[PDB]
Amino acid sequence: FTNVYADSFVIKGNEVSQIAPGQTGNIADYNYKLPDDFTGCVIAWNSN
Amino acid sequence: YFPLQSYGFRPTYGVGHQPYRVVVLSFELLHAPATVCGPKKSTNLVKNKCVNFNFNGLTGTGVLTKSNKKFLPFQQFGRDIVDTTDAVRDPQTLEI
Amino acid sequence: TQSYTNSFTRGVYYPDKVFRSSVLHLTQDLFLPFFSNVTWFAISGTNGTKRFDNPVLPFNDGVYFASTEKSNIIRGWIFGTTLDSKTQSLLIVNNATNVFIKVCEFQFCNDPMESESGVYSSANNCTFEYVSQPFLMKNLREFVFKNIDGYFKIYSKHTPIIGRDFPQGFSALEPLVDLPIGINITRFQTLLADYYVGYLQPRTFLLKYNENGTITDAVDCALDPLSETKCTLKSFTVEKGIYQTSNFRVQPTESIVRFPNVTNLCPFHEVFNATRFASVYAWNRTRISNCVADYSVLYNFAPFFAFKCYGVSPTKLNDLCFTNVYADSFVIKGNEVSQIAPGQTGNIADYNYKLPDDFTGCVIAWNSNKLDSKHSGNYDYWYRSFRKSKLKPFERDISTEIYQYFPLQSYGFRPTYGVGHQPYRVVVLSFELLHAPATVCGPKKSTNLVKNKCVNFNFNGLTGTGVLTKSNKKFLPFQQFGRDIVDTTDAVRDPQTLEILDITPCSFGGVSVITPGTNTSNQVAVLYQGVNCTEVSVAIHADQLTPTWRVYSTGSNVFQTRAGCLIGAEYVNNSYECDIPIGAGICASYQTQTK
Amino acid sequence: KFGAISSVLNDILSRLDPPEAEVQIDRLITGRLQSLQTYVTQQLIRAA
Amino acid sequence: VSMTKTSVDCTMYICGDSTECSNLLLQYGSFCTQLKRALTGIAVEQDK
Amino acid sequence: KVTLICAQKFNGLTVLPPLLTDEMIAQ
Ligand SMILES: *[C@@H]1O[C@H](CO)[C@@H](O[C@@H]2O[C@H](CO)[C@@H](O)[C@H](O)[C@H]2NC(C)=O)[C@H](O)[C@H]1NC(C)=O
Ligand SMILES: *[C@@H]1O[C@H](CO)[C@@H](O)[C@H](O)[C@H]1NC(C)=O
Ligand SMILES: *[C@@H]1O[C@H](CO)[C@@H](O)[C@H](O)[C@H]1NC(C)=O
Ligand SMILES: *[C@@H]1O[C@H](CO)[C@@H](O)[C@H](O)[C@H]1NC(C)=O
Ligand SMILES: *[C@@H]1O[C@H](CO)[C@@H](O)[C@H](O)[C@H]1NC(C)=O
Ligand SMILES: *[C@@H]1O[C@H](CO)[C@@H](O)[C@H](O)[C@H]1NC(C)=O
């Protein structure tokens, strides 16, 4: 890899499926957007 | 209108509302130009034979020989008239 | 802005990490254009030899910097946005032992006789520090500063020029350092205690590599028709002949938007903010017509659970025109929101409501629990567990039959259920789009109608480029559009005046370059194919012609042929054998004339 | 249309975001490029 | 003896006045160049 | 017997004139 970056945050479980390339919604538009030409991984773990 | 909301969640909410920790790892891949690489056991360098090779993520098959090309200290790869890879720099010895 | 000079064959850098040998590589990157203007800074510009401050310069898609210097008066650069400590900035400084590059939330304090001092004493919330051998070391000290894909790329070259302050030779800059910062860098300033600043633009260059991995020459493909020819052939030597290298088009000068002068707003308020909602099995269908389809109101009414469009983008609904805005208003369980979509399988798609697969429209869902969730609940609910057969698209069965089992259930939901069971109000907007035949259109500010010019136009959602003229076509009152033998739109009716306008395509054609050969002369002629010389001259004067280069185009060197307009050759009445063919009996040749 | 929602590129770009438009545009590009290849091949045969 | 000499602007046929389409077209390599040379060769042949 | 505005087929398709005109062929 040339640019391993790590974005660390906590979200509601129902938003986990929304953080992905090409998604539409309130998190994609107002909190954080991913590019569509996205190489990487999204890892989610319940932190309750 | 106050756009930002700071609300903690109770353990009694449905799991769709409970917090999850999420890490997004952004991996730009640009044809093996860098030092970050997954764990692999390095082997010896074998020249003048047809071998498989993995050079910093660059995967291929060929015969490796001593190069007489004059690369600048910056340059790591060589290509011919048809954009086919024809030279590499060894990541441990910096041999071309 | 003390003075302006021209860069000459300078600012080329190695675009990548690939070694190349004895090749000509045609590449697109951000480069300083050849013979472009550069601002020459008259030590320190506004500042003198030793004065309080100097202005901040723009950083437009990368900057070329150069300065022939032995005293090392220029010892650094700052990159940033506000440069007032409210935004992070990047400081590169050289102490002649090491170069220190840092990114912190810096405050500019007018940091620069017989005095030296530390700079940028306020440096809060520092996040990045890098140290290396000095960047600086008669010596040009050329640098290119580029900031793309997060990385701040610094390239440099040092040359031994004794007799010239700005050398006329050629060299390529080598990469010096490439840092993973991720900073905007809208503007920058040079730190002193003479120099040239140029700016990079997207350009295509043909780069000549030596036997070794070095660049010895380059040609800027957009500088002149000869360079364009060289790039087309990928050679620095061009043989005698005529070559087709590019096409030309006349660009629109202005844009016009014409929609019916309708002031009625679409009743999105009543549909979304409804007192009562339809049951699940029997959605309430209304029709929206003869109104302005302003969709910002939906975002003003509530934050949404989901706003997912299938045939359109949610951003662009206010630009499009619609023929059949229909609104289906109903309340469902949250877990069913994801099931109302084209192509879905399940109990709601099959027994309550089906969408077509060729669906243009939007599905908007909003949790309604604040109004609809009660211990008794809202008894508008009527879900259909069983239906004798699958429901057709847009079909609604109001009547209820008992299966030989009671298919319909009326249950209110308590506020204590998981959100997947709580009610959500959902509105489905069906948008049939049929090439702009209708009065419903998003809010847009109408402009004047501009005729006899190449313009962009938007006619009731029909988008295009062309020249609009008075039409002599006899349309019936019903007919709104005209098409030719090949189903290309060639006529519209103005939505406000009902005037019939013809659409003529804007001038376009090939460009050929007539070259005597580079072993004789670098003078070339340009043929614009299939166009009148008057139209070309007007396009040049208006700065509408797509290619950015211009031929001198003075009196008596512009000649009209059947092939096209020939600019850069003097027509004579002395015939000769054909040399370089042009067409229709006309040939060109490089000859000795008058002396 | 060659499988696209519309034969007109201006309508695809007016209606869809780049990530969906690229799919519809690639369907139109494939169809137009094959049409040009057919034309050029038959012009070469006629030229012979 | 001769055939009508034609010329085709490949980009303007496939991707007329569309930058997004042109950029997608670039991923197919030099097809427009091969077609352009073929039609130029035909055009020259007819005058020959 | 056998039958510069690009009025028809203005979709990037142009027609180039012959090098020799009908008059030159007649000559
Ligand atoms: C490429 O680099 C080499 C080494 O820096 C240059 O030097 C010459 O290399 C050839 C190789 O066969 C020798 O025979 C010469 O004697 C070298 N000259 C000197 C002065 O050392 C070479 O000139 C470079 N290539 C070009 C085209 O300049
Ligand atoms: C560049 O600076 C301007 C200063 O007004 C700022 O508005 C802009 O957002 C900056 N660029 C980026 C990419 O943020
Ligand atoms: C626009 O206003 C003019 C005013 O004379 C009117 O004649 C015309 O009918 C209006 N257009 C529409 C679409 O109503
Ligand atoms: C819109 O919502 C508000 C909420 O306070 C309500 O008072 C108003 O009556 C609603 N409008 C309609 C048409 O129901
Ligand atoms: C259904 O839509 C019609 C449209 O005229 C409206 O009058 C009626 O009140 C609506 N009913 C419900 C329950 O939304
Ligand atoms: C160019 O336009 C003028 C009128 O503006 C006309 O007289 C002339 O014949 C035209 N030339 C060609 C080649 O069409």
CSV table of N, CA and C in Angstrom, one decimal, chain B residues 1 17 28 33 69-81 83, chain C residues 14 16-23 25 149 151 174-175 212-213 303 419:
chain,number,residue,atom,x,y,z
B,1,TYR,N,-31.6,27.1,13.6
B,1,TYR,CA,-31.6,25.6,13.6
B,1,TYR,C,-30.1,25.2,14.0
B,17,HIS,N,-29.7,1.6,17.1
B,17,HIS,CA,-29.4,2.9,17.7
B,17,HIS,C,-28.1,2.9,18.5
B,28,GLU,N,-4.7,3.5,-1.2
B,28,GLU,CA,-4.4,3.8,-2.5
B,28,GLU,C,-3.3,2.9,-3.0
B,33,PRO,N,4.9,1.4,-5.4
B,33,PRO,CA,5.9,2.4,-5.2
B,33,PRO,C,6.3,2.7,-3.8
B,69,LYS,N,21.0,-0.4,-17.2
B,69,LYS,CA,20.3,0.9,-17.4
B,69,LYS,C,20.7,1.8,-16.3
B,70,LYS,N,20.8,3.1,-16.6
B,70,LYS,CA,21.2,4.2,-15.7
B,70,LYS,C,20.0,4.9,-15.1
B,71,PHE,N,19.5,4.3,-14.0
B,71,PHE,CA,18.3,4.9,-13.3
B,71,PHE,C,18.8,6.0,-12.4
B,72,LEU,N,18.0,7.0,-12.3
B,72,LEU,CA,18.3,8.1,-11.3
B,72,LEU,C,18.0,7.5,-9.9
B,73,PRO,N,18.6,8.0,-8.8
B,73,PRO,CA,18.3,7.5,-7.5
B,73,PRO,C,16.9,7.5,-7.2
B,74,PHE,N,16.1,8.4,-7.7
B,74,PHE,CA,14.7,8.5,-7.5
B,74,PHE,C,13.9,7.4,-8.3
B,75,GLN,N,14.3,7.1,-9.5
B,75,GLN,CA,13.5,6.1,-10.3
B,75,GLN,C,13.6,4.7,-9.8
B,76,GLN,N,12.5,4.0,-9.8
B,76,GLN,CA,12.5,2.6,-9.3
B,76,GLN,C,12.1,1.6,-10.3
B,77,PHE,N,11.4,1.9,-11.4
B,77,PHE,CA,10.9,1.0,-12.4
B,77,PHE,C,11.3,1.5,-13.8
B,78,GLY,N,11.5,0.5,-14.7
B,78,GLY,CA,11.7,0.9,-16.1
B,78,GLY,C,10.6,0.2,-17.0
B,79,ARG,N,10.3,0.9,-18.1
B,79,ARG,CA,9.3,0.4,-19.1
B,79,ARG,C,9.9,0.7,-20.5
B,80,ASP,N,9.5,-0.2,-21.4
B,80,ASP,CA,10.0,-0.1,-22.8
B,80,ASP,C,8.9,0.8,-23.6
B,81,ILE,N,9.1,0.8,-24.9
B,81,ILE,CA,8.3,1.6,-25.9
B,81,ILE,C,6.8,1.2,-25.8
B,83,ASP,N,5.0,0.3,-22.8
B,83,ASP,CA,4.5,0.4,-21.4
B,83,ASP,C,4.4,-1.0,-20.8
C,14,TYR,N,9.8,15.5,-14.2
C,14,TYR,CA,9.5,14.1,-14.5
C,14,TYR,C,8.2,13.7,-13.9
C,16,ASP,N,6.5,11.0,-13.3
C,16,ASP,CA,6.2,9.7,-12.7
C,16,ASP,C,7.6,9.1,-12.2
C,17,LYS,N,7.5,7.9,-11.7
C,17,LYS,CA,8.6,7.1,-11.1
C,17,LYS,C,9.2,6.2,-12.1
C,18,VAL,N,8.6,6.1,-13.3
C,18,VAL,CA,9.1,5.2,-14.4
C,18,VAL,C,10.3,5.7,-15.2
C,19,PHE,N,11.3,4.8,-15.3
C,19,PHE,CA,12.5,5.0,-16.1
C,19,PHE,C,12.1,4.8,-17.6
C,20,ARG,N,12.5,5.7,-18.4
C,20,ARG,CA,12.3,5.5,-19.9
C,20,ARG,C,13.6,5.8,-20.6
C,21,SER,N,13.8,5.1,-21.7
C,21,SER,CA,15.0,5.2,-22.5
C,21,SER,C,14.8,5.2,-24.0
C,22,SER,N,15.2,6.3,-24.6
C,22,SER,CA,15.1,6.5,-26.1
C,22,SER,C,13.7,6.3,-26.5
C,23,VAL,N,12.7,6.9,-25.8
C,23,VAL,CA,11.3,6.9,-26.2
C,23,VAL,C,10.9,8.4,-26.2
C,25,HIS,N,7.5,10.1,-25.0
C,25,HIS,CA,6.3,9.8,-24.2
C,25,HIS,C,5.4,10.9,-24.2
C,149,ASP,N,-3.9,14.8,-4.8
C,149,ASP,CA,-4.2,13.5,-4.2
C,149,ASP,C,-3.6,13.5,-2.8
C,151,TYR,N,-1.0,14.5,-1.4
C,151,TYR,CA,0.5,14.8,-1.4
C,151,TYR,C,0.9,16.1,-2.0
C,174,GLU,N,13.9,17.4,-11.3
C,174,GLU,CA,13.8,16.0,-10.7
C,174,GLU,C,13.0,16.1,-9.5
C,175,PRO,N,12.3,15.0,-9.1
C,175,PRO,CA,11.5,15.0,-7.8
C,175,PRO,C,12.5,15.1,-6.7
C,212,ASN,N,19.8,7.4,-21.4
C,212,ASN,CA,19.7,7.3,-20.0
C,212,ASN,C,18.3,7.9,-19.6
C,213,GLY,N,18.0,7.7,-18.3
C,213,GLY,CA,16.7,8.1,-17.8
C,213,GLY,C,16.5,9.5,-17.6
C,303,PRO,N,-35.8,16.3,8.4
C,303,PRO,CA,-34.8,15.4,8.1
C,303,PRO,C,-35.4,14.1,7.7
C,419,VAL,N,-37.5,0.4,16.3
C,419,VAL,CA,-37.7,1.3,15.2
C,419,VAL,C,-38.1,0.5,13.9
